Write an enzyme that holds these catalytic residues in place. Structure first.
Site, PDB file in Angstrom:
ATOM      1  N   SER A   1    -100.711 -94.580  23.729  1.00  0.00           N
ATOM      2  CA  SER A   1    -100.336 -94.936  25.089  1.00  0.00           C
ATOM      3  C   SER A   1     -99.342 -96.097  25.096  1.00  0.00           C
ATOM      4  O   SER A   1     -99.346 -96.937  24.192  1.00  0.00           O
ATOM      5  CB  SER A   1    -101.586 -95.330  25.876  1.00  0.00           C
TER       6      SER A   1
ATOM      7  N   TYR B   1     -94.280 -94.854  29.350  1.00  0.00           N
ATOM      8  CA  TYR B   1     -94.343 -95.240  30.761  1.00  0.00           C
ATOM      9  C   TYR B   1     -93.066 -96.071  30.910  1.00  0.00           C
ATOM     10  O   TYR B   1     -92.757 -96.877  30.027  1.00  0.00           O
ATOM     11  CB  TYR B   1     -95.544 -96.144  31.054  1.00  0.00           C
TER      12      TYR B   1
ATOM     13  N   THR C   1     -94.887 -89.637  30.821  1.00  0.00           N
ATOM     14  CA  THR C   1     -95.933 -89.478  31.837  1.00  0.00           C
ATOM     15  C   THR C   1     -95.307 -89.815  33.177  1.00  0.00           C
ATOM     16  O   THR C   1     -94.791 -90.911  33.373  1.00  0.00           O
ATOM     17  CB  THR C   1     -97.114 -90.408  31.578  1.00  0.00           C
TER      18      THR C   1
ATOM     19  N   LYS D   1     -95.477 -84.989  30.940  1.00  0.00           N
ATOM     20  CA  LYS D   1     -96.878 -84.979  31.346  1.00  0.00           C
ATOM     21  C   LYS D   1     -97.074 -85.395  32.802  1.00  0.00           C
ATOM     22  O   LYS D   1     -96.375 -86.271  33.300  1.00  0.00           O
ATOM     23  CB  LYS D   1     -97.658 -85.917  30.417  1.00  0.00           C
TER      24      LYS D   1
ATOM     25  N   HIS E   1    -104.006 -86.480  35.696  1.00  0.00           N
ATOM     26  CA  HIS E   1    -104.441 -87.760  35.157  1.00  0.00           C
ATOM     27  C   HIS E   1    -105.948 -87.944  35.146  1.00  0.00           C
ATOM     28  O   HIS E   1    -106.437 -89.064  35.316  1.00  0.00           O
ATOM     29  CB  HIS E   1    -103.814 -88.897  35.957  1.00  0.00           C
TER      30      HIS E   1
HETATM   31  C1  LIG Z   1    -109.425 -94.944  30.752  1.00  0.00           C
HETATM   32  C2  LIG Z   1    -108.274 -93.998  30.881  1.00  0.00           C
HETATM   33  C3  LIG Z   1    -106.921 -94.487  30.583  1.00  0.00           C
HETATM   34  C4  LIG Z   1    -105.738 -93.642  30.655  1.00  0.00           C
HETATM   35  N1  LIG Z   1    -104.488 -94.132  30.247  1.00  0.00           N
HETATM   36  C5  LIG Z   1    -103.385 -93.345  30.205  1.00  0.00           C
HETATM   37  C6  LIG Z   1    -102.083 -93.834  29.647  1.00  0.00           C
HETATM   38  O1  LIG Z   1    -101.987 -94.978  29.214  1.00  0.00           O
HETATM   39  N2  LIG Z   1    -101.014 -92.881  29.630  1.00  0.00           N
HETATM   40  C7  LIG Z   1    -101.083 -91.506  30.133  1.00  0.00           C
HETATM   41  O2  LIG Z   1    -100.148 -90.807  30.078  1.00  0.00           O
HETATM   42  N3  LIG Z   1    -102.296 -91.080  30.643  1.00  0.00           N
HETATM   43  C8  LIG Z   1    -103.367 -91.890  30.680  1.00  0.00           C
HETATM   44  N4  LIG Z   1    -104.650 -91.391  31.097  1.00  0.00           N
HETATM   45  C9  LIG Z   1    -104.764 -89.956  31.440  1.00  0.00           C
HETATM   46  C10 LIG Z   1    -105.136 -89.137  30.198  1.00  0.00           C
HETATM   47  O3  LIG Z   1    -104.102 -89.044  29.299  1.00  0.00           O
HETATM   48  C11 LIG Z   1    -105.612 -87.720  30.506  1.00  0.00           C
HETATM   49  O4  LIG Z   1    -104.603 -87.035  31.354  1.00  0.00           O
HETATM   50  C12 LIG Z   1    -106.910 -87.607  31.294  1.00  0.00           C
HETATM   51  O5  LIG Z   1    -107.914 -88.463  30.811  1.00  0.00           O
HETATM   52  C13 LIG Z   1    -107.414 -86.191  31.213  1.00  0.00           C
HETATM   53  O6  LIG Z   1    -108.729 -86.025  31.840  1.00  0.00           O
HETATM   54  P1  LIG Z   1    -110.152 -86.115  31.248  1.00  0.00           P
HETATM   55  O7  LIG Z   1    -110.414 -87.564  31.023  1.00  0.00           O
HETATM   56  O8  LIG Z   1    -111.148 -85.461  32.178  1.00  0.00           O
HETATM   57  O9  LIG Z   1    -110.019 -85.375  29.937  1.00  0.00           O
HETATM   58  C14 LIG Z   1    -105.900 -92.188  31.091  1.00  0.00           C
HETATM   59  C15 LIG Z   1    -107.280 -91.720  31.401  1.00  0.00           C
HETATM   60  C16 LIG Z   1    -108.453 -92.529  31.302  1.00  0.00           C
HETATM   61  C17 LIG Z   1    -109.782 -91.879  31.608  1.00  0.00           C
HETATM   62  C1  LIG Z   2    -103.912 -97.095  38.638  1.00  0.00           C
HETATM   63  C2  LIG Z   2    -103.167 -98.043  37.699  1.00  0.00           C
HETATM   64  C3  LIG Z   2    -103.092 -97.501  36.278  1.00  0.00           C
HETATM   65  C4  LIG Z   2    -102.350 -98.391  35.238  1.00  0.00           C
HETATM   66  C5  LIG Z   2    -102.288 -97.823  33.786  1.00  0.00           C
HETATM   67  C6  LIG Z   2    -102.242 -96.278  33.683  1.00  0.00           C
HETATM   68  C7  LIG Z   2    -103.435 -95.543  33.007  1.00  0.00           C
HETATM   69  O1  LIG Z   2    -103.118 -94.169  33.067  1.00  0.00           O
HETATM   70  C8  LIG Z   2    -104.868 -95.734  33.658  1.00  0.00           C
HETATM   71  O2  LIG Z   2    -105.278 -94.665  34.422  1.00  0.00           O
HETATM   72  O3  LIG Z   2    -105.604 -96.710  33.515  1.00  0.00           O
END
Ligand SMILES: Cc1cc2nc3c(=O)[nH]c(=O)nc-3n(C[C@H](O)[C@H](O)[C@H](O)COP(=O)(O)O)c2cc1C
Ligand SMILES: CCCCCC[C@H](O)C(=O)O
Ligand SMILES: Cc1cc2nc3c(=O)[nH]c(=O)nc-3n(C[C@H](O)[C@H](O)[C@H](O)COP(=O)(O)O)c2cc1C
Ligand SMILES: Cc1cc2nc3c(=O)[nH]c(=O)nc-3n(C[C@H](O)[C@H](O)[C@H](O)COP(=O)(O)O)c2cc1C
Ligand SMILES: Cc1cc2nc3c(=O)[nH]c(=O)nc-3n(C[C@H](O)[C@H](O)[C@H](O)COP(=O)(O)O)c2cc1C
Ligand SMILES: CCCCCC[C@H](O)C(=O)O
Ligand SMILES: CCCCCC[C@H](O)C(=O)O
Ligand SMILES: CCCCCC[C@H](O)C(=O)O
Lengths: 353, 353, 353, 353
Positions: A105, A128, A153, A228, A252
């Site tokens: 990430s 990002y 993303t 994405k 997401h």
């Molecule tokens: C704690 C947390 C942090 C996330 N951080 C990012 C990130 O930094 N970049 C990104 O593209 N998606 C981010 N996502 C989305 C994930 O890549 C993914 O699309 C999502 O978790 C898919 O759903 P699921 O948790 O039910 O498998 C995050 C999701 C969670 C739960």
């Molecule tokens: C809602 C603000 C999100 C800031 C970081 C992105 C990451 O995907 C996450 O869902 O924690």
């Protein structure tokens, strides 16, 4: 008594501080999004093909033309070091041990370089864009360190309204930081250089990033490029039209827009229209979920919370365990429906309910 | 205060050790399969035909050309001796007393011969193939002992992920054993003979059994042959094409593949396409369930857990009681919808909801 | 704090002995029938017609060509004297006071004559046929006492499996009896006369009553004749073809066949096909329920449990109260949807959900 | 810890006397109406358009040709002074501060004049017609005081059966009164003048108001005229045909007819058929609800209970807060679906579920 992803969720909830657990498990607003993400799998049941020889099964498959042990990936997630010490590395290593890719990430607790140095598996970088010039810095940084794929993303134009974090006044754990932004100069009082510090003090990203900007990124990155956060066949098609090598249907994990459709809702269509690799995530917890998506045309499924539960509960070994169960789960599923080769999956094995 | 199958379930849960009860009642994974198996009956309601003379009703019907007291059967279930002493015989006798067939499981606690010797009703044998040569042994064994029908079960290529047994570390009760495998030689150090002991120490069966192997079995068995575990009209049609005299639509009572469709979902179609006897099981507890299926074209319904509840709760008499209630239930149902002869049932009496 | 039918149900449950309350409220088997009877009304919502003058509303309507205060009726129910002293008369009087008909049950606690003598409202007689000769006796008995309409109930070929009564070992209250059968001779040892005593000792009726028998009854009764218990447009059409002046779509308030469709499911069709009066009951508790049915073409709605709650809770005045609320409820409803004259209702005011 | 409308509801329930809270939150009869009003939003999910520049968003829009800060309005609600001291003024001021209109109820606790004198925002007047001559009085009164729009509410021909008020024997708080009716003469013993006092002592309005009467009102009022309480595209079209400048699809927040369809059910159609401004209310609590409606063609959404929760919980500042959250909510939503200009919303961003 850890036999499925859920068991790891329960175990993680018992070990994590409520604040961190809520950060992980939380969704946007009423959280009908995350519930829908799970429910949508019940719209498809299996119609197994009997009397097929399944004594020799293969979960091996090609993602973006490159073969891996199975159609899975540990997706990009921010603040892994808050779930477990050096979470980013613990994950990258379980992914590499399982023979599948790991996506770092932009907001990881370990840098693009430290990981590339401490791990030799297939490493992808999720980008990002807060500051255009800063973005290019990481892009080349990842390019030089040997990252094979870049993932843009797009579903975080603005931050999602996640109330669990609001009620908890959630704050990024002190001992942790956004390493990929560390050292991004300063002292440079030029204007341009100042117009960067403003973005670095903003948990807000470039809401301006449009298709034109995707072209800029397409020229900048020479390897496989995926977009994405898509939720329409139209948008996936546009991405391919603009140079993308594939897309990631995703909402997401229900953390951005509560009433967002599940990517499963536009998967078959996106596959039919793009004619290119359509990956997906959001809601996957069971091997049956993964298989239904693969059966619908998905090239691979990215794991978000599932593997994070293994990490938060038992660190690296916990991630190995979740992946081991999921592989066995997937394997057992192909055997039951009579599709020995994971690459032979088709809508033929499904029944819409 | 035992007026329906459910009452027997409650009574059985009170008498059985949790471990055994869970073995019996358990399903695969989340157990959405067993719930779906029940729910699917609510997609059909009755449209009774009034002012029909129903003072003389008949539940008598022909299954595979042979007449029996009613369109029911006690289906093949493993480890009955764990639910009640000599459960296999208690069941065979209640079935025979009711005038319907009993199907002995490959994994029964009483042997193909002991039963055939202690019971004179219509006996069917359900075959599981672990070792091809061993399979032929039981097949001929059942043929010589006078079993009328052979049933090949195909939905256990690999074992279903049943977590209740996992959380309980379930173990086959010590005082019990898989009698049909007892005495299957040894000491024979040839290779072939060794390539059998490996399969005998494997709770895993021949995942290799394909259509070609069905032909081998078709030639081997001279009487009625049915294929159990089918979930598509296409597969039932293939089975008939390969020699089967009929098929058994079934998802193993939701114990093999949790997201498996209910056989009710492909019953009408299988009946229309095969033009041959289509039997069924999985989820049946009420006489109304049984009647809806018979109304849709099913030739007969096999009982799994329903009769096992009567057995686990009150042994043989308990099975007699469950069958007595179900017959009365079925009888009362025909009277209400105005179809005095069970053989006159048609989709005409149904309403899809 | 008695503002709707439900309030009376609660009040009745507090005053009635569990055994009697269960007799009243109970349904067949799992009781999905009574729940469905209620749920089916949610498949239609209102689309009010605004800016219509509704300052002068009329609930007056014609049932079978005869005008009454409103499209309602207190339907035939057995053992009313068990819910309240002289329940049959308390009901007949509230019905007569409200300006609507009352239907005496074959199994009432007051006789066809005692009522006709103590009440002067529109009295209907519901007939159950246990013994053909005995049936004719009551028919003429009601004809001579001045009953205007005869209602043949056909959905009790055999008794419905009602488990609440089974768990309670329900028994007809000692102080009560089936008055309409009292005095039906005896001592007559002829054979014919003996072949009647067997039926009088049987809570089982003539399951033999067919269409031919309906003709016999049609010739026997000179006034309006209705057939109750129909659940198909086909059967209602046949009844009209055989002489009936109208029919009553009904599933006996979910007490006979648990998986029976709701008469609402075939109401519009029955109205279109018969071209004759189509009355209905089963599930009605709200004025909105009644209006939706009237809007779909029903000529009138018969009340079962609704008015019985008023009776069981507060006797005659309780029935007056339930009728008063329901009339006001119906009235208020017409005003809201903009249909001042109850006879102008059409599918136009509805929306299927 | 007040982050959404719901939080304000909870806070209001803690501060309001049960009687007043029930008056506010209550619905008609079983209250399936208010539940349906909420549920209906789940029939639509978002299909965001990615890679769109959303760094510069605009919630500004034109309602009836006049620009306002956002497509919202604080709708007309009676007895606001019972929820909070001078509630009518507290609301009008939050609306005016937010840049959106406020609609004064005919049954407000502050008069048409006192408000017009103490507030300078866009003021609308909702008219209820009890007495034709009295109606004209308020109409001109509002016309002279500078009210821009008049709103005729038509869904209260008779009062809705709201049982919470019935169980509570609800009574209009003593310290409060229906100011707009205060001073409406008396002593005038003419007949005409007496035929007004009868209506003033009646919580019952002119159920007689028809289309012809709408013409009378159309000629009487020279500015924008809207008809509120419509639930069919046909009725909205008629209103436009009769002179209305627009309509308000609404079921009175589920307080009049419990089984009334949600205005969302006929929104798209009304927009297509009228070709004129179609506003709406009933059930809106989330920004996503508001956006789905705007996306379907609605010109603006009126808030009922949402803002009343902010008022009842924290008075004027509480209303400012609810509006601030809703604007941010709406803003955040446009950003997520990729529609920077609120006026570009179309059915294109939706998915019917
Ligand atoms: C704690 C947390 C942090 C996330 N951080 C990012 C990130 O930094 N970049 C990104 O593209 N998606 C981010 N996502 C989305 C994930 O890549 C993914 O699309 C999502 O978790 C898919 O759903 P699921 O948790 O039910 O498998 C995050 C999701 C969670 C739960
Ligand atoms: C809602 C603000 C999100 C800031 C970081 C992105 C990451 O995907 C996450 O869902 O924690
Ligand atoms: C405890 C248990 C053991 C079983 N053992 C066997 C077996 O040995 N052979 C077979 O073909 N099916 C087996 N089955 C499946 C049944 O034959 C039948 O398909 C299933 O129980 C039908 O569902 P129901 O239990 O809801 O009626 C078993 C089911 C249960 C509940
Ligand atoms: C306690 C009870 C007794 C009944 N007895 C009779 C009867 O004697 N004759 C008949 O035709 N129907 C009988 N019915 C059926 C009713 O006439 C009517 O169809 C039914 O109650 C309608 O449903 P509802 O109770 O939801 O209104 C009875 C119903 C109840 C609840
Ligand atoms: C306490 C209360 C009082 C109301 N008073 C009026 C009124 O005086 N005039 C009117 O036209 N509508 C009136 N309404 C209806 C509202 O204008 C609006 O249609 C409704 O509240 C919309 O639903 P919502 O509350 O879910 O937003 C009232 C609603 C409530 C909850
Ligand atoms: C999942 C392993 C099952 C092994 C025996 C088959 C039998 O059908 C049963 O469901 O218990
Ligand atoms: C199930 C036996 C019913 C015998 C009398 C008929 C009456 O309709 C009732 O439902 O109680
Ligand atoms: C049901 C009687 C309502 C009388 C005033 C109208 C207002 O819309 C309200 O819903 O309270």
């Amino acid at each position: 008594n850890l036999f499925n992803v859920e068991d790891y969720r329960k175990l993680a909830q018992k070990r994590l501080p409520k604040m961190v657990y809520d950060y992980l498990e939380g969704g946007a607003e009423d959280e009908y999004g995350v519930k829908h993400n799970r429910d949508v799998f019940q719209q498809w049941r299996f119609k197994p093909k009997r009397l097929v020889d399944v004594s020799r099964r293969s979960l091996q498959a090609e993602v973006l033309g490159k073969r891996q042990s199975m159609p899975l990936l540990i997706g990009p997630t921010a603040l892994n070091g808050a779930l477990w010490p050096k979470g980013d590395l613990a994950l990258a290593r379980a992914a590499t041990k399982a023979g599948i890719p790991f996506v770092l990430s932009t907001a990881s607790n370990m840098s693009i370089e430290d990981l590339a140095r401490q791990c030799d598996g297939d490493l992808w970088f999720q980008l990002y864009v807060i500051h255009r010039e800063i973005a290019q810095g990481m892009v080349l940084k990842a390019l030089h360190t040997g990252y094979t794929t870049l993932v843009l993303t797009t579903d975080v134009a603005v931050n999602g309204y996640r109330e669990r974090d609001l009620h908890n006044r959630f704050k990024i754990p002190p001992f942790l930081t956004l390493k990929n932004f560390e050292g991004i100069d300063l002292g440079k009082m030029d204007k341009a250089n100042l117009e960067m510090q403003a973005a670095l003090m903003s948990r807000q990203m470039d809401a301006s990033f449009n298709w034109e900007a995707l072209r800029w990124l397409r020229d900048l990155w020479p390897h496989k490029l995926l977009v994405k956060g898509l939720l329409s066949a139209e948008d996936a098609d546009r991405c391919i039209a603009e140079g993308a090598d594939g897309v990631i249907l995703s909402n997401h994990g229900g953390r951005q827009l509560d009433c967002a459709i599940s990517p499963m809702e536009v998967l078959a269509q996106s596959v039919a229209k793009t004619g290119k690799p359509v990956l997906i995530d959001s809601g996957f917890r069971r091997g049956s979920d993964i298989v239904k998506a693969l059966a619908l045309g998905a090239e691979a499924v990215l794991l978000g919370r599932a593997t994070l539960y293994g990490l938060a509960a038992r660190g690296e070994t916990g991630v190995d365990e979740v992946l081991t169960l999921l592989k066995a789960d997937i394997d057992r599923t192909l055997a039951q429906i009579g599709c020995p080769d994971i690459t032979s999956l088709s809508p033929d094995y499904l029944q819409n309910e």
